Amino acid sequence: DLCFTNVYADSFVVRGDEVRQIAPGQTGRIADYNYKLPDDFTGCVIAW
Amino acid sequence: VFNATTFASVYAWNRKRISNCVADYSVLYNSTSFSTFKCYGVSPTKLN
Numbered sequence A: 001d002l003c004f005t006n007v008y009a010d011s012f013v014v015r016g017d018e019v020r021q022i023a024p025g026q027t028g029r030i031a032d033y034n035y036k037l038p039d040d041f042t043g044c045v046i047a048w
Numbered sequence B: 001v002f003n004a005t006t007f008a009s010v011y012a013w014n015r016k017r018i019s020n021c022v023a024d025y026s027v028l029y030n031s032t033s034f035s036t037f038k039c040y041g042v043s044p045t046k047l048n
Protein backbone atom coordinates (compact mmCIF):
# COMPACT_ATOMS: atom_id res chain seq x y z
CA ASP A 1 0.00 0.00 0.00
CA LEU A 2 3.03 2.24 -0.64
CA CYS A 3 4.63 4.01 -3.61
CA PHE A 4 8.44 3.82 -3.76
CA THR A 5 10.93 6.43 -5.01
CA ASN A 6 14.42 6.03 -6.52
CA VAL A 7 14.36 2.25 -6.83
CA TYR A 8 17.63 0.43 -7.56
CA ALA A 9 18.38 -3.30 -7.74
CA ASP A 10 21.87 -4.69 -7.07
CA SER A 11 22.72 -8.29 -7.92
CA PHE A 12 25.56 -10.74 -7.36
CA VAL A 13 26.51 -14.28 -6.31
CA VAL A 14 28.24 -15.25 -3.05
CA ARG A 15 28.81 -18.49 -1.17
CA GLY A 16 26.31 -19.67 1.41
CA ASP A 17 28.38 -18.71 4.46
CA GLU A 18 28.85 -15.08 3.41
CA VAL A 19 25.15 -14.28 2.91
CA ARG A 20 25.00 -13.13 6.54
CA GLN A 21 27.49 -10.36 5.74
CA ILE A 22 25.02 -8.48 3.50
CA ALA A 23 23.62 -6.33 6.29
CA PRO A 24 24.34 -2.89 7.79
CA GLY A 25 27.19 -2.84 10.29
CA GLN A 26 29.09 -6.03 9.44
CA THR A 27 32.70 -7.10 8.97
CA GLY A 28 34.38 -9.75 6.86
CA ARG A 29 35.98 -10.03 3.44
CA ILE A 30 32.75 -9.32 1.53
CA ALA A 31 31.69 -6.37 3.67
CA ASP A 32 35.23 -4.96 3.73
CA TYR A 33 36.59 -5.33 0.20
CA ASN A 34 33.60 -6.17 -2.01
CA TYR A 35 30.20 -4.73 -1.01
CA LYS A 36 29.24 -2.30 1.77
CA LEU A 37 25.88 -1.00 3.00
CA PRO A 38 25.05 2.31 4.71
CA ASP A 39 24.15 2.60 8.37
CA ASP A 40 20.84 4.29 7.45
CA PHE A 41 19.77 1.84 4.75
CA THR A 42 16.12 1.68 3.65
CA GLY A 43 15.32 -1.29 1.45
CA CYS A 44 15.25 -5.06 1.35
CA VAL A 45 17.70 -7.94 0.91
CA ILE A 46 16.67 -11.16 -0.87
CA ALA A 47 18.79 -14.27 -1.33
CA TRP A 48 18.14 -17.77 -2.68
CA VAL B 1 43.28 -21.77 18.20
CA PHE B 2 41.34 -22.07 14.94
CA ASN B 3 43.74 -24.48 13.20
CA ALA B 4 44.22 -26.81 16.20
CA THR B 5 44.08 -30.46 15.12
CA THR B 6 42.04 -31.67 18.11
CA PHE B 7 39.21 -29.81 19.84
CA ALA B 8 37.78 -30.47 23.29
CA SER B 9 34.45 -32.03 24.17
CA VAL B 10 31.68 -29.69 25.22
CA TYR B 11 31.56 -31.06 28.77
CA ALA B 12 35.30 -30.26 29.29
CA TRP B 13 36.18 -27.07 27.34
CA ASN B 14 39.74 -25.75 26.97
CA ARG B 15 39.61 -22.17 28.42
CA LYS B 16 42.87 -20.87 26.85
CA ARG B 17 44.46 -17.50 27.77
CA ILE B 18 45.83 -14.79 25.43
CA SER B 19 47.99 -11.70 25.97
CA ASN B 20 50.69 -9.48 24.41
CA CYS B 21 49.47 -9.55 20.81
CA VAL B 22 47.91 -7.32 18.15
CA ALA B 23 44.66 -9.15 17.21
CA ASP B 24 44.77 -8.49 13.45
CA TYR B 25 42.04 -10.83 12.20
CA SER B 26 42.08 -10.18 8.45
CA VAL B 27 44.86 -12.79 8.33
CA LEU B 28 42.03 -15.33 8.61
CA TYR B 29 40.15 -14.21 5.48
CA ASN B 30 42.09 -16.47 3.12
CA SER B 31 42.16 -19.59 5.30
CA THR B 32 38.81 -20.06 7.06
CA SER B 33 35.10 -19.38 6.57
CA PHE B 34 32.75 -18.80 9.50
CA SER B 35 29.05 -19.64 9.37
CA THR B 36 28.37 -17.94 12.72
CA PHE B 37 29.95 -14.79 14.14
CA LYS B 38 28.14 -12.56 16.61
CA CYS B 39 29.40 -10.01 19.14
CA TYR B 40 27.88 -8.74 22.40
CA GLY B 41 28.74 -5.44 24.08
CA VAL B 42 30.62 -4.00 21.09
CA SER B 43 30.07 -3.32 17.40
CA PRO B 44 32.00 -5.44 14.86
CA THR B 45 33.21 -2.35 12.99
CA LYS B 46 35.10 -0.94 16.01
CA LEU B 47 37.13 -4.10 16.64
CA ASN B 48 40.14 -2.59 14.83
Ligand SMILES: *[C@@H]1O[C@H](CO)[C@@H](O)[C@H](O)[C@H]1NC(C)=O
Pocket: B030, B031
Ligand atom coordinates in the same frame (compact mmCIF):
# COMPACT_ATOMS: atom_id res chain seq x y z
C1 LIG C 1 44.04 -18.32 -0.47
O1 LIG C 1 43.72 -19.67 -0.09
C2 LIG C 1 43.93 -20.63 -1.15
C3 LIG C 1 43.48 -21.97 -0.61
O2 LIG C 1 44.50 -22.95 -0.75
C4 LIG C 1 45.38 -20.63 -1.59
O3 LIG C 1 45.55 -21.53 -2.68
C5 LIG C 1 45.78 -19.22 -2.02
O4 LIG C 1 47.16 -19.20 -2.36
C6 LIG C 1 45.51 -18.24 -0.89
N1 LIG C 1 45.86 -16.89 -1.30
C7 LIG C 1 47.11 -16.42 -1.25
C8 LIG C 1 47.30 -15.01 -1.71
O5 LIG C 1 48.05 -17.10 -0.85
